[PDB]
Design a protein around this ligand. Structure first.
Ligand SMILES: O[C@@H]1C[C@@H]2[C@@H]3C[C@H](O)[C@H]4[C@@H]3C[C@@H]2[C@H]41
Length: 147
């Protein structure tokens, strides 16, 4: 009886129930609250050596493994969720996307424009919500739905 995409789960380390969204890879403790023509998102991309284009403004030759990229993503998610860092700050500094220079903002978009896992996560996010790691041919994304 959750907004589709959501399932109940159990913390392995604490035993407390939590909720996990298999479209956004978001996870949270509270029972989730519960589509538009367009959404607006920012993202932080970490590329890896199997990215469609393993290069970025940060690195001419991206050589980190997918596993290493996921660990970087996971670390950014932790710092964002703790408030130690802001999403926009980490995107500006560390996103392997040209959108880093705009704090990760991609602007508004419809279905059919973005890579499908990105599109599905973006449209499943609530306004203001952040994704977990989202995988595309570009790399691994943290997605923030801003509108
Ligand atoms: O090894 C790691 C790297 C990432 C993707 C490749 C695959 O093999 C799985 C999938 C989700 C993680 C894990």
């Amino acid at each position: 009886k959750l907004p589709p995409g959501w399932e109940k789960a159990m913390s392995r380390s604490s035993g407390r129930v939590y909720y996990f969204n298999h479209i956004t890879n978001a996870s949270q403790w509270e029972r989730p609250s519960g589509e538009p023509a367009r959404v607006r998102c920012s993202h932080l991309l970490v590329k890896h050596s199997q990215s469609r284009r393993p290069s970025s403004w940060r690195q001419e030759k991206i050589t980190r493994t997918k596993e290493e990229a996921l660990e970087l993503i996971n670390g950014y998610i932790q710092k964002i969720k703790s408030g130690e860092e802001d999403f926009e700050s980490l995107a500006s500094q560390f996103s392997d996307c040209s959108s880093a220079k705009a704090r990760g903002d991609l602007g508004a978009f419809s279905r059919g424009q973005m890579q499908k896992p990105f599109e599905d996560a973006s449209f499943a996010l609530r306004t203001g919500e952040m994704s977990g790691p989202v995988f595309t041919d570009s790399g691994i994304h943290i997605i923030l739905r801003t509108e």
